[PDB]
């Protein structure tokens, strides 16, 4: 049964609600982005209208084989009418194709659903600036002050300089980057650009990347592993055993691996500056864990919400425990009293 925080009152609409069978009263199903916790339940047998971005629609058609007649892509930053309700899709600064959705209810209420997002001050100059929002359905993944991490720009700087140093010291080193979903493509693309290489990968991952409208992508990626000195591997293989086994397959082309594991936040963020990060090393294999996040830090979240001044907030992440829910409500009240709304 579909939970309340996936339903949009006063409409026939649901958001990221594909795993509950046929939802009673739902005339249009919105999908914020192509991550499996959110698309869970879609397939080629789905026969209700799906509303999403153009990129999310390319992935629905090519990866899950949803038939074209049920896929309704919408342009961003553009007022659209769906089943007689005005909607707009905004960039969520999450993974490729990820959107937030503004719904303009017939009774005059305005609702923003952020999907998954990384809040940024640049959102304060989108179409959000123009009007009041009554209810916010908020990605609260890191809604606690302990959750600090660097900008994406600082993390990429660390990774490019680390990779370029290693391979200039040893021209026979291979760089490996872990992946399990779309998102975080800047990690491997930035590293391959500084090394003058294409990124090599499996046929299934190359397929996924071809759906993403990334400029000049044919120049950046390849399924020919032998021509490439940056390889992508499934995240599960990013460990000493998996990497040893990969090096064996490269036919004595390489004598060292440097590997990156993009994570979200980890507790070593509570102690160590990005500058000071060191790898785990066994023999000729080193593994860096780097805190590349596609969700808001606590401070980024707080700034967006205090700017938006919503009348009511409905969390969409960490809603399963009483202690979580109570923690989040406390922070929302602090933010409200501090800013005066
Ligand atoms: Ni996500």
UniProtKB/Swiss-Prot annotation:
Induction of its expression: During mitosis. The mRNA encoding this protein contains an internal ribosome entry site (IRES) in its 5'-UTR. This 5'-UTR generally suppresses translation while specifically promoting expression during mitosis, when cap-dependent translation may be impaired.
Tissue: Expressed in brain, heart, kidney, liver, pancreas, placenta and skeletal muscle.
Localisation per UniProt entry: Nucleus
Family of this protein: Belongs to the DNA repair metallo-beta-lactamase (DRMBL) family.
Self-association and partners: Binds constitutively to TP53BP1. Binds CDC27, which is itself a component of the anaphase promoting complex (APC). Binds PIAS1.
Task of the protein: May be required for DNA interstrand cross-link repair. Also required for checkpoint mediated cell cycle arrest in early prophase in response to mitotic spindle poisons. Possesses beta-lactamase activity, catalyzing the hydrolysis of penicillin G and nitrocefin. Exhibits no activity towards other beta-lactam antibiotic classes including cephalosporins (cefotaxime) and carbapenems (imipenem).
Designated name of the protein: DNA cross-link repair 1A protein
Organism per entry: Homo sapiens (Human)
